[PDB]
Design a protein around this ligand. Structure first.
Ligand SMILES: CC(C)=CCC/C(C)=C/CC/C(C)=C/CC/C(C)=C/COP(=O)(O)OP(=O)(O)O
Ligand SMILES: *C/C=C(\C)CC/C=C(\C)CC/C=C(\C)CCC=C(C)C
Ligand SMILES: [Cl-]
Ligand SMILES: [Zn+2]
Lengths: 4, 314, 346
């Protein structure tokens, strides 16, 4: 996951 | 110990040392949403992880179990937290954990949990001796990794390791003058050491940037740095800058340069300068040059800027 | 080319169903995947293809409720999934004590957000517990952590906190003065907003900062006109055709929303080039499986599918609802939220  | 892909790997449900524990399964209820299917091996490790967590068992076997849970999913923050709890409870060798996390991050440099884990370790050890070199290795595979730069700034500030960073920045700007992360680092070092109020420093920096701009005129990063260190002092307070830039327009032109000029003219108008109406026209002329031929993609924006200048200075 | 609407509807449907084990790393944030899918269907006006009632129960089973003795308030909110093994309970009985069970700010956010999208009235949400949990996450510098056990802290979570307070229509969940201070201190010398002070400004954090201020209704009060002009300049400079997240980096579909939405909030999105942006977004469309990818000829994912659609929405794509740029839900959903807030105030 790129954002979390 | 026993690797997940070793020929002799044994499910936890078949290990004697785990016979006393009742595995705890996950249950998404009657109608599961965004349900992920898990292999026997995966579900087996986590069914025991849940068991150990639920009982807050601070054991050595639980510690080894987290290694497997992490190999299966390094993005599970709960696992990392529990592993930290265990690191303390069992008073494990933190220098060894540093080797561990160092390998994990190299394989997954974009994971938030692994960088957070390393930071906690460095805080615990109060030892930043390995940090700058480790980060430089990561930045060597991806010079723009946001996590790496963030960790680097934290280490440098927390343990006051400013001595060689400006040199590191200079080295990277030679490798790729377009790396926006490095220009940010440069401003980070300078503003946290000497600062920019020292005219000798400001001059050194402005001169350094102009040299970089001359090498690669189409570089937003260099132009943003130049404007960044002068905008608050007042762009119109630097007469030789305006002329030096106008002298670059002939060859080293670019939308960034034109934009800079517009911003200088705007600062002038902002400071009740001489030839107000004449300056305004010099600005408007540039806005239109940007809109019609130099930065066409922002055509409507530049025109919008132009109209803003007219209704504000007439 | 053209917008393959039906293909994207199916894509989102599949996201809500069953995923191959290769997506295991999304386990702890399944709730946000649900959000991308649900909000994405809402945006395409197709929430009818799902069973709102089943999903609402699932979401409620993710709420960390206070225990009988209310000794775990600082840990309430929503979980990303049921990976801890806690017995299924759609917020019916009280909370079952567990040493490591707590909410996650991004999940509390997407959770509440999903409930509103599905039509729930949030009556089963222990509002006070969530706000108590939220307060516990704020640090001295004004930013937030994701979980009470500790984690990284940055702008992303400031935005989550803001959205939660906004949706629960109660700002006791944070010390607004300190949050605003954190947002101001994140402004870079190049005028964009970074994840934190001194860091490189980024399209994502700029959106989080600006949207947070708009949700608080304090944009104008926090930044001067000169400052807002500098931010606008930084943001509009992000467009190359599509948008990139920071200077000298390649464009990525999701920035069409992160940056585009920021420009919309700053009232100058109208001055950007629509055609080039639209053409780029569509070039990352997977014509076979549906959804969007970050780059053309790249694999699609729920996140880029959702933000690509919201990016298209900003320019009023034929067939896509208008997105509320700051709340990150359809205007229709934001409207339904307005009604809800009204009904409570009685
Ligand atoms: C809607 C949901 C589920 C959450 C909203 C709240 C969050 C977590 C927002 C995150 C916004 C965001 C994209 C922040 C940027 C963080 C960052 C510095 C990412 C760096 O990733 P890279 O992949 O290196 O980016 P590039 O695109 O610049 O290459
Ligand atoms: C932080 C990162 C996120 C949220 C990415 C989430 C991505 C998902 C859920 C991918 C879903 C993929 C599906 C349904 C099928 C795609 C199949 C192929 C490309 C072969
Ligand atoms: Cl607009
Ligand atoms: Zn993206």
């Amino acid at each position: 996951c790129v954002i979390l | 110990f026993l690797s997940l892909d070793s020929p002799t790997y044994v499910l936890y449900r078949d290990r004697a040392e785990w016979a006393d524990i009742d595995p705890v399964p996950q249950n998404d209820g009657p109608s599961p949403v965004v349900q992920i299917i898990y292999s026997e091996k995966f579900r087996d490790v986590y069914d025991y992880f849940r068991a150990v967590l639920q009982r807050d068992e601070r054991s050595e076997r639980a510690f080894k179990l987290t290694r497997d849970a992490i190999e299966l999913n390094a993005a599970n923050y709960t696992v990392w937290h529990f592993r930290r709890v265990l690191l303390r409870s069992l008073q494990k060798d933190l220098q060894e954990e540093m080797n561990y996390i160092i390998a994990i991050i190299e394989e997954q440099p974009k994971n938030y949990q692994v960088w957070h884990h390393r930071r906690v370790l460095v805080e615990w050890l109060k030892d930043p001796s390995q940090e700058l070199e480790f980060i430089a290795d990561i930045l060597n595979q991806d010079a723009k990794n946001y996590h790496a730069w963030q960790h680097r700034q934290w280490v440098i500030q927390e343990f006051r390791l400013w001595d060689n960073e400006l040199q590191y920045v200079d080295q990277l700007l030679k490798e790729d003058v377009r790396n926006n992360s490095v220009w940010n680092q440069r401003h980070f070092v300078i503003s946290n050491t000497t600062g920019y109020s020292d005219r000798a420093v400001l001059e050194r920096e402005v001169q350094y940037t102009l040299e970089m701009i001359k090498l690669v005129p189409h570089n937003e990063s260099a132009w943003n740095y130049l404007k960044g260190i002068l905008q608050d002092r007042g762009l119109s307070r630097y007469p030789n800058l305006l002329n030096q830039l106008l002298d670059l327009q002939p060859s080293h032109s670019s939308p960034y340069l034109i934009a800079f000029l517009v911003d200088i003219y705007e600062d002038m108008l902002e400071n009740q300068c001489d030839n107000k109406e004449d300056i305004l026209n010099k600005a408007l002329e540039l806005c239109e040059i940007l809109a019609k031929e130099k930065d066409t993609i922002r055509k409507e924006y530049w025109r919008y800027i132009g109209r803003s200048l007219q209704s504000k200075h007439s | 080319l053209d917008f393959l609407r039906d293909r994207h509807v199916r894509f989102f449907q599949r996201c809500l169903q069953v995923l191959p084990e290769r997506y295991s790393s999304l386990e702890t944030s399944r709730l946000t995947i649900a959000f991308f899918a649900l909000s994405g269907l809402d945006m395409l006006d197709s929430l009818d293809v799902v069973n709102k009632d089943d999903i609402i129960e699932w979401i409620y089973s993710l709420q960390v409720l206070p225990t009988e003795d209310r000794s775990n308030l600082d840990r309430c909110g929503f979980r990303g999934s049921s990976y801890l093994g806690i017995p299924f309970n759609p917020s019916k009985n009280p909370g079952t004590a567990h040493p490591y069970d707590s909410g996650h700010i991004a999940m509390t956010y997407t959770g509440l957000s999903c409930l509103i999208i599905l039509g729930d009235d949030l009556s089963r949400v222990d509002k006070e517990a969530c706000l108590a949990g939220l307060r516990a996450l704020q640090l001295e510098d004004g930013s937030f952590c994701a979980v009470p056990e500790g984690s990284e802290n940055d702008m992303r979570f400031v935005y989550c906190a803001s959205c939660i307070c906004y949706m629960l229509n109660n700002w006791s969940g944070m010390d607004m003065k300190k949050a605003i201070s954190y947002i101001r201190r994140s402004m870079s010398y190049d005028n964009g907003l970074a994840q934190g002070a001194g860091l490189e400004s980024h399209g994502g954090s700029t959106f989080c900062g600006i949207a947070s201020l708009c949700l608080m209704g304090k944009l104008e009060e926090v930044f001067s006109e000169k400052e807002l002009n500098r931010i606008k300049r930084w943001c509009i400079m992000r467009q190359q055709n599509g948008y990139h997240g920071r200077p000298n980096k390649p464009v990525d579909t999701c920035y069409s929303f992160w940056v585009g939405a920021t420009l919309k909030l700053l009232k100058i999105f109208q001055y950007t080039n629509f055609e080039k942006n639209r053409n780029y977004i569509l070039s990352t469309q997977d014509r076979l499986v549906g959804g969007f990818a970050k780059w053309p000829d790249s694999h699609p994912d729920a996140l880029h599918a959702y933000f690509g659609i919201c990016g298209l929405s900003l320019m009023e794509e034929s067939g896509i609802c208008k997105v509320h740029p700051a709340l990150n839900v359809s205007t229709r959903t934001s409207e339904r939220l307005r009604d809800l807030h009204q009904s409570w105030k009685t």
